[PDB]
Design an enzyme around this catalytic site. Structure first.
Site, mmCIF file in Angstrom:
data_model
loop_
_atom_site.group_PDB
_atom_site.id
_atom_site.type_symbol
_atom_site.label_atom_id
_atom_site.label_comp_id
_atom_site.label_asym_id
_atom_site.label_seq_id
_atom_site.Cartn_x
_atom_site.Cartn_y
_atom_site.Cartn_z
ATOM 1 N N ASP A 1 10.157 -7.258 7.354
ATOM 2 C CA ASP A 1 8.942 -6.488 7.571
ATOM 3 C C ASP A 1 8.594 -6.584 8.960
ATOM 4 O O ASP A 1 7.434 -6.994 9.512
ATOM 5 C CB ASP A 1 7.851 -7.317 6.600
ATOM 6 C CG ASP A 1 7.870 -6.950 5.193
ATOM 7 O OD1 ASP A 1 7.420 -7.670 4.472
ATOM 8 O OD2 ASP A 1 8.574 -5.941 4.916
ATOM 9 N N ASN B 1 6.351 -12.734 4.655
ATOM 10 C CA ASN B 1 7.198 -12.106 5.322
ATOM 11 C C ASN B 1 8.630 -12.624 5.622
ATOM 12 O O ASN B 1 9.558 -12.155 6.476
ATOM 13 C CB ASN B 1 6.477 -11.557 6.673
ATOM 14 C CG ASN B 1 5.769 -10.221 6.406
ATOM 15 O OD1 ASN B 1 5.432 -9.737 5.141
ATOM 16 N ND2 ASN B 1 5.057 -9.571 7.579
ATOM 17 N N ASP C 1 2.813 -9.920 12.344
ATOM 18 C CA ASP C 1 2.497 -9.945 11.069
ATOM 19 C C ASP C 1 2.999 -11.346 10.468
ATOM 20 O O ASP C 1 3.495 -11.147 9.193
ATOM 21 C CB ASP C 1 2.772 -8.675 10.129
ATOM 22 C CG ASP C 1 2.164 -8.815 8.987
ATOM 23 O OD1 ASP C 1 2.752 -7.904 7.928
ATOM 24 O OD2 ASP C 1 1.008 -9.400 8.629
ATOM 25 N N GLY D 1 14.320 -15.505 -2.070
ATOM 26 C CA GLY D 1 13.087 -15.301 -2.427
ATOM 27 C C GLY D 1 12.108 -15.492 -0.984
ATOM 28 O O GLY D 1 12.539 -15.799 -0.017
ATOM 29 N N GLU D 2 10.743 -15.013 -1.320
ATOM 30 C CA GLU D 2 9.820 -15.313 -0.367
ATOM 31 C C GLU D 2 9.350 -16.730 -0.040
ATOM 32 O O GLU D 2 9.281 -17.390 -0.939
ATOM 33 C CB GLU D 2 8.439 -14.521 -0.400
ATOM 34 C CG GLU D 2 8.783 -12.791 -0.883
ATOM 35 C CD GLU D 2 7.423 -12.373 -1.117
ATOM 36 O OE1 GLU D 2 6.553 -12.851 -1.342
ATOM 37 O OE2 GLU D 2 7.547 -11.027 -1.262
ATOM 38 N N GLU E 1 19.992 -6.078 4.313
ATOM 39 C CA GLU E 1 20.663 -7.106 3.682
ATOM 40 C C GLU E 1 19.854 -7.488 2.450
ATOM 41 O O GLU E 1 18.529 -7.788 2.954
ATOM 42 C CB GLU E 1 20.908 -8.086 4.840
ATOM 43 C CG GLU E 1 21.604 -9.039 4.389
ATOM 44 C CD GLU E 1 22.711 -9.762 5.295
ATOM 45 O OE1 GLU E 1 23.666 -9.243 5.888
ATOM 46 O OE2 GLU E 1 21.994 -10.843 5.839
ATOM 47 N N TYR E 2 20.223 -8.025 1.448
ATOM 48 C CA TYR E 2 19.504 -8.481 0.406
ATOM 49 C C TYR E 2 19.437 -10.172 0.692
ATOM 50 O O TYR E 2 20.320 -10.581 0.777
ATOM 51 C CB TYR E 2 19.961 -8.145 -1.001
ATOM 52 C CG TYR E 2 19.472 -8.870 -1.933
ATOM 53 C CD1 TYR E 2 18.297 -8.926 -1.992
ATOM 54 C CD2 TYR E 2 20.102 -9.448 -3.041
ATOM 55 C CE1 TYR E 2 17.314 -9.467 -3.378
ATOM 56 C CE2 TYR E 2 19.456 -10.211 -4.297
ATOM 57 C CZ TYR E 2 18.333 -10.261 -4.193
ATOM 58 O OH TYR E 2 17.608 -10.940 -5.428
ATOM 59 N N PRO F 1 18.587 -13.211 -1.339
ATOM 60 C CA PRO F 1 18.054 -13.491 -2.792
ATOM 61 C C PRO F 1 17.391 -14.770 -3.047
ATOM 62 O O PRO F 1 16.773 -14.893 -4.112
ATOM 63 C CB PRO F 1 19.505 -13.631 -3.562
ATOM 64 C CG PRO F 1 20.431 -14.073 -2.387
ATOM 65 C CD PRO F 1 20.171 -13.481 -1.075
ATOM 66 N N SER G 1 0.765 -0.976 0.074
ATOM 67 C CA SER G 1 0.128 0.142 -0.009
ATOM 68 C C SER G 1 0.909 1.411 0.091
ATOM 69 O O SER G 1 0.739 2.220 -0.785
ATOM 70 C CB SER G 1 -0.985 -0.207 1.294
ATOM 71 N N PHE G 2 2.004 1.220 0.817
ATOM 72 C CA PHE G 2 2.656 2.720 1.251
ATOM 73 C C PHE G 2 3.746 2.808 0.371
ATOM 74 O O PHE G 2 4.540 3.743 0.603
ATOM 75 C CB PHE G 2 2.952 2.657 2.440
ATOM 76 C CG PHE G 2 1.481 2.917 3.400
ATOM 77 N N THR H 1 -2.967 -9.274 9.241
ATOM 78 C CA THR H 1 -3.336 -9.799 8.141
ATOM 79 C C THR H 1 -4.479 -10.542 8.249
ATOM 80 O O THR H 1 -4.297 -11.413 9.329
ATOM 81 C CB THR H 1 -2.358 -10.546 7.225
ATOM 82 O OG1 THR H 1 -1.279 -9.587 7.017
ATOM 83 C CG2 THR H 1 -2.756 -10.919 6.060
ATOM 84 N N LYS I 1 3.462 -14.424 8.380
ATOM 85 C CA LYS I 1 3.021 -15.144 7.183
ATOM 86 C C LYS I 1 4.121 -15.484 6.418
ATOM 87 O O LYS I 1 5.240 -14.545 6.215
ATOM 88 C CB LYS I 1 1.988 -14.132 6.600
ATOM 89 C CG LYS I 1 2.263 -12.635 6.383
ATOM 90 C CD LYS I 1 1.254 -11.767 5.480
ATOM 91 C CE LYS I 1 1.869 -10.354 5.528
ATOM 92 N NZ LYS I 1 0.556 -9.279 4.985
ATOM 93 N N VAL J 1 9.587 -2.504 -2.333
ATOM 94 C CA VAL J 1 11.112 -2.793 -1.817
ATOM 95 C C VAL J 1 11.639 -2.950 -3.231
ATOM 96 O O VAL J 1 11.165 -3.833 -4.247
ATOM 97 C CB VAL J 1 10.873 -3.928 -1.034
ATOM 98 C CG1 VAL J 1 12.321 -4.597 -0.661
ATOM 99 C CG2 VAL J 1 10.201 -3.925 0.282
#
Ligand SMILES: NC(=[NH2+])c1ccsc1
Lengths: 13, 352
Positions: B186, B173, B168, B128-129, B123-124, B126, B55-56, B203, B170, B59
């Site tokens: 997050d 995140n 939060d 994925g989620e 920190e990146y 890589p 929403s705001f 959520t 899930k 990334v």
């Protein structure tokens, strides 16, 4: 039946 | 009993070491919590790709021009952060992230703000989620889900000992790192709370019933959310599943849950005790605290210390083609970053 995509959090419901 | 003498003595000693660790961890946290700003600026980074949007803001993957290191940069549009609790929460996020330190928590590297935006550079990760791997494979086997859950249990034990509620949890995140371990990111809903708190936030599928019912609530909402996460990881879908939020809320409050036929009885027993509407009966909220979870049969094969020390071979190692690889993330529409000539909301974000 429900939401399968990414789910947004609500800061103030 | 369930344990022989040797087993029970070891466990007791292990629990006392946990207390020793958490005491030292709190000392280090409080030092940084009391003395937390402006550690870089936008032009120090090249923007590469949008990794996620909400929403705001977004990334993005960025590359630090001087060192060539890659980072994940979160951008918040100060105006879009207009809502009362949207604002306080943004200050919570930055202050918590700059003070914590734990192997499964993402590390903040820089933060700063300009006329239009707030920025947090971390920190990146890589791999994925978890969300996209879970949806792609369908569901995780119970040993695979257990490996991830154990990391969340330890992370929440750490956070709660610092009086931090996460709020939060899930798969969206939770990032997977190069060794297959979790990085919780997050912290936008995380808050330092000595007793109860009252904000209606989170959520919908992961909300504890006491949040939905407008009760003052405490850290036990995170243990409920753990139950939702474990269920979703092991089933492929969450336990309270409907199209509109109000239907989700009604299922949550009912005190009912149904399980897939492939769930082990040990798993169902754990989830019944986490997805417990009665706070006097919810695991994590009883006299023995987190140990009711750690000592549950479903975690009997878990070596808690070995997970923390990252000695356990991960069930899944994400593919990585090199520094800056974004192949494990989905694609999103790109929008250039426009910085206004005039400062917006200078007073609201003075502390950031
Ligand atoms: N902060 C996140 N959720 C995120 C998603 C993709 S890269 C970072």
């Amino acid at each position: 039946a429900g939401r399968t995509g990414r789910r947004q959090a609500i800061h103030d419901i | 009993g369930h344990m022989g003498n040797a087993a029970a003595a070891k466990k007791g000693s292990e629990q006392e070491s946990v207390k020793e660790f958490l005491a030292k961890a709190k000392e280090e946290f409080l030092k940084k919590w009391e003395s937390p700003q402006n550690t870089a600026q936008l032009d120090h980074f090249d923007r590469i790709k949008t990794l996620g949007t909400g929403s705001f803001g977004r990334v993005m993957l960025v590359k630090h021009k001087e060192t060539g290191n890659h980072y994940a940069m979160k951008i918040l549009d100060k105006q879009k952060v207009v809502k009362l609790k949207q604002i306080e929460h943004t200050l919570n996020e930055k202050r918590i992230l700059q003070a914590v330190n734990f192997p499964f928590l993402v590390k903040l590297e820089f933060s700063f703000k300009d006329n239009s935006n707030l920025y947090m550079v971390m920190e990146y990760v890589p791999g994925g989620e978890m969300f996209s791997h879970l949806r792609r494979i369908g569901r995780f086997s119970e040993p695979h889900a257990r490996f991830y859950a154990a990391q969340i249990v330890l992370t929440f034990e750490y956070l709660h000992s610092l009086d931090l509620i996460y709020r939060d949890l899930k798969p969206e995140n939770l990032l997977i790192d190069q060794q297959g371990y979790i990085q919780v990111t997050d912290f936008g809903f995380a808050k330092r709370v000595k007793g109860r708190t009252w904000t209606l936030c989170g959520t919908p599928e992961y909300l504890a019933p006491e949040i939905i019912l407008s009760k003052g609530y405490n850290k036990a909402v995170d243990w409920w959310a753990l139950g939702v996460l474990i269920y979703e990881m092991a089933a492929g879908y969450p336990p309270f599943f409907a199209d509109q939020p109000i239907q989700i809320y009604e299922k949550i409050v009912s005190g009912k849950v149904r399980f897939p036929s492939h769930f082990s009885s040990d798993l169902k027993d754990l989830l019944r005790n986490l997805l417990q509407v009665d706070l006097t009966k919810r695991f994590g909220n009883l006299k023995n605290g987190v140990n009711d979870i750690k000592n549950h049969k479903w975690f009997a094969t878990t070596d808690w210390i070995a997970i923390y020390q990252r000695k356990v071979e991960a069930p899944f190692i994400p593919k990585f083609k090199g520094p800056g690889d974004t192949s494990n993330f989905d694609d999103y529409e790109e929008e250039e970053i426009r910085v206004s000539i005039n400062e917006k909301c200078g007073k609201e974000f003075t502390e950031f």
